Amino acid sequence: QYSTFHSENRDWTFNHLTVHRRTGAVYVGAINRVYKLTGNLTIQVAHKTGPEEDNKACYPPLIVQPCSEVLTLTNNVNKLLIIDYSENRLLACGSLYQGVCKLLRLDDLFILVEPSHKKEHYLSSVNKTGTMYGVIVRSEGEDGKLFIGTAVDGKQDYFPTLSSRKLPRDPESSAMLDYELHSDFVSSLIKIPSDTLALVSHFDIFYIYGFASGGFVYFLTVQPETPLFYTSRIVRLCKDDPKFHSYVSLPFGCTRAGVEYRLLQAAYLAKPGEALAQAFNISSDEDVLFAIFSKGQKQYHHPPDDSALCAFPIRAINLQIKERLQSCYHGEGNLELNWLLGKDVQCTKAPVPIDDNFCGLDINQPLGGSTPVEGLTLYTTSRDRLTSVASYVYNGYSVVFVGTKSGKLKKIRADGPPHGGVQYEMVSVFKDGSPILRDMAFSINQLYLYVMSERQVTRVPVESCEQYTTCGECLSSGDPHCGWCALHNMCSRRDKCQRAWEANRFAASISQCMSLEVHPNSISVSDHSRLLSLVVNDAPNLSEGIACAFGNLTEVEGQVSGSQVICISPGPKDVPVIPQDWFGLELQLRSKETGKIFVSTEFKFYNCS
Ligand SMILES: *[C@@H]1O[C@H](CO)[C@@H](O)[C@H](O)[C@H]1NC(C)=O
Ligand SMILES: *[C@@H]1O[C@H](CO)[C@@H](O)[C@H](O)[C@H]1NC(C)=O
Ligand SMILES: *[C@@H]1O[C@H](CO)[C@@H](O)[C@H](O)[C@H]1NC(C)=O
Ligand SMILES: *[C@@H]1O[C@H](CO)[C@@H](O)[C@H](O)[C@H]1NC(C)=O
Fold this sequence. Notes:
Helix content: under 10%
Subunit structure: Homodimer. Interacts with RND1. Interacts directly with NRP1 and NRP2. The PLXNA2 homodimer interacts with a SEMA6A homodimer, giving rise to a heterotetramer.
Oligomer: part of a larger assembly
Protein name: Plexin-A2
Subcellular location: Cell membrane
Largest sheet: 6 strands, mixed
Structural class: mainly beta
Number of strands: 44
Organism: Mus musculus
CATH topology of the largest domain: Methylamine Dehydrogenase, Chain H
Domain Sema: 1-462
Radius of gyration: 31 Å
CATH class of the largest domain: Mainly Beta
Bound molecules: 2-acetamido-2-deoxy-beta-D-glucopyranose
């Protein structure tokens, strides 16, 4: 019974989702709509973005200059949704009018500005989802910039495939969304060459994901392989490089057991957790890129189910790039980036020191490479295709959530070789079997993960430990969230277990589970009302009081001293009725501190007659 929000319309489908880290406001980008919802997915405001009359042939767009073309009522696909944290704004870009963007207030989604007066304010007319990504970069003191990667719809001269645009703090800035750098010969953008479009029909580059880490930004792309096959790549730029000389692009993927997964589907940047940090030999607070790959390099449009979850430490990505740079600056081989260069170009040997933070020169760039960056494969399936990924760290454990094509959400505990991570739970989110989309986001305290299909957004609890009804089940579940709350007789998070910090109140390994011993273990029916001496192993304080329940029969107050409890057998009018020569029962202790029955052990009655 998860909180959920449905699309208002079978055709106004959901595209993107983001959650404000501080307010917990949920923003959903959808066709013709941007929604602001509460934590439990109740609408507080909905901004309408379409439909509107339009035509892709109107360039510049209708909103800028008159157009003679026949117009058609057109749906506005949300292509970009990013929170501009320092400025309390939401960036929302659609497919209408050659892809202008809006800046919206976070509180009421009211429009701040909609840049439309320059040609670079038109991001792209592509109206398919999952082909564009952006990353905002702004340090304290800096005005701000926005890196955008996008498919260009074969309009290579209208729209850069990747570029940097100004994103000033002042919404009214006369420079809003201009190119960071524009010169006759040098600008802060990459254009797809006509040559490449000529070589490959409907060639385009799809931007699956993007993130900032350290001094760089990273974009993850899929595109047709220039002489079908696709290549998934990591693209890196220095954060401060208006000339784009730092451009480096390397293929990536992963393998396991003769199977190659080289077709990128989804990705998410997070911390490693202790196991992965060890495996990668990095520090706990260093970044790791988690990714979903489909089998092979073919069939981009119709992937098989065979897919994998893979992890790439940012450190290894940077290292392999630095070494590529050093090899190239030593004069070895060529730049190897045919799609962008249009020919083989030799690496230039030059007396230039390359450090971790090398930001390029006008030689040896843009830089490519044929050797893939290999990730650590964590999990594979051949059954239900993996479609999404999010991850965080709980108590030093990496918990990776992976959505599927049939609306399942897998919960995977990560560790390195041998053969980790491990799926400890799978949950059905969408009963109609709809694919889970790429965008997932956590609530403010990582209590929930918000997950979306085309027609639904659902708030999914990160854990449901209480589904485990014994200490044994609880602590053998594999779920890093779950421990056994001793006195409340329940499986929960440490933080959900009152006085968990007190001795033996919270069990974190199957070993700490309480056991009960009775002395003696059995009595004769003719021996009613006898004093039994009980011992509770691994007990917390019981001095608050203990009652003794002999099954459904009686319940008496017990005598407490440390972890020992004295209780009196039931009287003659309560001694059970033997079938057999013996009648079994369950002697249970009740905590007066909590009111809950929390342990029991078998107790026997007999009749030697
Ligand atoms: C969700 O939040 C709203 C606040 O507007 C509240 O009225 C509603 O009861 C909540 N829904 C739940 C948790 O059932
Ligand atoms: C999206 O744009 C394409 C242009 O190639 C068009 O053919 C298609 O009908 C559009 N789909 C909509 C209206 O969402
Ligand atoms: C792991 O890192 C440490 C320093 O951080 C280094 O000494 C060691 O060589 C590395 N482990 C390997 C590669 O065996
Ligand atoms: C014991 O009592 C329980 C409910 O307290 C009842 O369901 C059960 O039938 C009883 N067992 C007997 C009478 O043996």
